[PDB]
Amino acid sequence: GTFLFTSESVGEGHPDKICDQISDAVLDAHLQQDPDAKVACETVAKTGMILLAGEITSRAAVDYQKVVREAVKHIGYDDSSKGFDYKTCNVLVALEQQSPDIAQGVHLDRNEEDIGAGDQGLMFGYATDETEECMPLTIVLAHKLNAKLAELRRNGTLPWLRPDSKTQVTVQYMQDRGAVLPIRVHTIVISVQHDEEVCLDEMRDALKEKVIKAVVPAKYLDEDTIYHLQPSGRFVIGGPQGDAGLTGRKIIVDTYGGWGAHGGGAFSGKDYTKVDRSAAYAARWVAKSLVKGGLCRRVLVQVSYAIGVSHPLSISIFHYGTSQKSERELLEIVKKNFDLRPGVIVRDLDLKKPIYQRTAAYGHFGRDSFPWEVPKKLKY
Ligand SMILES: C[S@@+](CC[C@H](N)C(=O)[O-])C[C@H]1O[C@@H](n2cnc3c(N)ncnc32)[C@H](O)[C@@H]1O
Ligand SMILES: O=c1oc2cc(O)ccc2s1
């Protein structure tokens, strides 16, 4: 009855995550001045370069050089010794206005509640009762290991740490009538960029004693737990110098770590009219409301849209057998309690607020009581 499941996470300085954070820093800069800004900002990072490419129609006056460099400074890339420096990197901008064909089909002359979806697509929401925050334990632990590395880098405990990191956690679970119960951590991988002076043995000892032990409860660790710590043996070259980064290349880290399902849409750099973000946040809100409301222990929600059409084209609820109610009854409860038009989701989840850079590392779900993490009281 037992099985293994693995999830990964990455740190703030992983090059794809740098791009997500810059794309959301650009979105927030626009929203601070123009709450109705139409933003579709992609970021690319490679050695010495941040390129912004995409489409923005906004009344805001944004200094892209300052926004980008301040985001890179926050991450910690502040010297050529680390492979990247916010003060001296190249910031290239290839931003145009939003296509007038998209604008006319989606939002021009439309009542806000009746704005069309900004694109077609499918999106999923997922929730599981295995943690209080209703997230899979594998991805929660993977994110916490990266957050711990950033904390020890920033407080000077492990001054040899650099911002680029990856983690991976494999948990052994038991099945329980469709729900899943974590038993133990089977394997942990940690890879983190480091300075040229620290030895491999010091790093491996610190990753076990100051990182893993400070994050994973001992009840999940045993003599058989496998540790792959700095498995490549050397990671001095990192950040965009070691690997090109792009916005929207960590969409599973951003969501459920392989659990549930994904429709393919990236979140970062997009305003609420892009249902890839707003409907995915609403779908998480629905899933978490069903679990916290005691209707099921685990649930997958699918929604889909057509460009220019406000209402979803389809809504589906899958409860893995963890509810006494049928999936059709859960679907009727969802339809009676939620309005998944983007122009209504924006009001319910306050999606014009400039809080998006905060979502762009450590996952968009299970953290900080964001509006989509506060369950809705269901009437039925
Ligand atoms: C291994 S690289 C991807 C493959 C790479 N583009 C290549 O040319 O082979 C992917 C991610 O792994 C991490 N990474 C980079 N250099 C690494 C190293 N020496 N050891 C371990 N992980 C590393 C970084 O987080 C990087 O973004
Ligand atoms: O410190 C952290 O705590 C959590 C909790 C989560 O549920 C997900 C991600 C993180 S990163």
Q: Which range marks the domain in which residue 217 is found?
A: 2-9+137-237
Residue 61, token pair as written in the block: 């006056």
Q: How far is the CA of 143 from the centre of ligand 2 (A)?
A: 6
Question: 8, 129, 132, 143: which to mutate for ligand 2, most atoms within 8 A of CB?
Answer: 143
DSSP code string of 306-337: -BT--S-SEEEEE-TT--SS-HHHHHHHHHHH
Asked if residues 233 and 194 have their Cβ atoms less than 8 Å apart, the reply is no
Let me know: does 94 contact 236? Beta carbons within 8 Å. no
Rounded Cα–Cα distance for residues 108 and 138 (Å): 43
Rounded distance between C-alpha atoms, residue 296 and residue 130, angstroms: 12
Ligand located closest to 146 CA: 2
Angle 12-18-19 (CA atoms, 0-180°, nearest 5)?
145
CATH number of the domain enclosing 193: 3.30.300.10
Let me know: does 116 contact 148? Beta carbons within 8 Å: no
d(CA 371, CA 283): 12
Q: Which residues contact 157 (CB under 8 A, 6 or more apart)?
A: 210
Secondary structure element (H or E) that encloses residue 97, with its range = none
- Residue 159: inside a domain, yes or no? yes
Query: Experimental method used, please?
Result: X-ray
Our answer to whether residue 223 is catalytic in this structure is no
> Would you call 226 exposed, middle or buried from its count of C-beta atoms within 10 A (0-12, 13-18, 19+)?
exposed
CA-based nearest residue to 277, from 298, 249, 255, 258: 255
What are all long-range contacts of 347-350, with beta carbons under 8 Å and residues at least 24 apart?
347/113, 348/282, 348/285, 349/278, 349/281, 349/282, 349/285
| Residue 162 labeled ligand binder | no
Reference 125, options 240, 335, 277; nearest CA is 277
Mutate which of 82, 167, 189, 191 for ligand 1 pocket (most atoms within 8 A of beta carbon): 191
What is the Å distance from ligand 1's center to 370 Cα? Answer: 32
**Would you tell me the crossing angle of helices 64-75 and 15-33 to the nearest 10 degrees?**
130
| Counted domains in the chain | 1
Q: Give the integer Cα–Cα distance in Å for 380 and 360.
A: 35
Residue type, 334: V
**Residue 196 resides in a domain:** yes
For 42, 133, 158, 212, 227, the CA distances from 205, given in Å and listed in that order, are 38, 31, 12, 10, 11
Indicate the resolution in Å.
1.4
- 14 assigned to a ligand binding site: yes
Q: What letter does residue 108 receive in the DSSP assignment?
A: T
CA 133 to CA 108: how far, in whole Å?
38
Q: Please report whether residue 150 resides in a domain.
A: yes
Let me know if residue 202 belongs to a domain. Answer: yes
The burial of 348, by beta-carbon neighbours within 10 Å (0-12 exposed, 13-18 middle, 19 or more buried), is given as middle
- Return the residues preceding each gap in the chain, C–N over 2.5 A, or none: none
DSSP for residue 377:
P
Residue 377 counted as domain residue: no
Q: Is 250 inside any structural domain?
A: no
Annotated catalytic residue 12? no
Exposed / middle / buried, residue 258 (Cβ in 10 Å: 0-12, 13-18, 19+):
middle
The residue annotated as part of the active site, out of 5, 8, 12, 16, is 16
- Ligand 2 pocket test: pick from 145, 362, 364 the residue with the most ligand atoms within 8 Å of its Cβ: 362
232 among annotated binding-site residues: yes
Nearest-CA residue for ligand 1 atom 2 is: 243
Query: Is 280 within a domain?
Result: no
| Residue 343 located in a structural domain | no
Q: Nearest residue CA, atom 11 of ligand 1?
A: 243
Strand ranges for 209-329 from DSSP E = 226-229, 245-246, 298-305, 314-318
Residue whose CA lies nearest to ligand 2 atom number 1 = 144
Q: 147, 244, 261, 306: which is the annotated catalytic residue?
A: 244
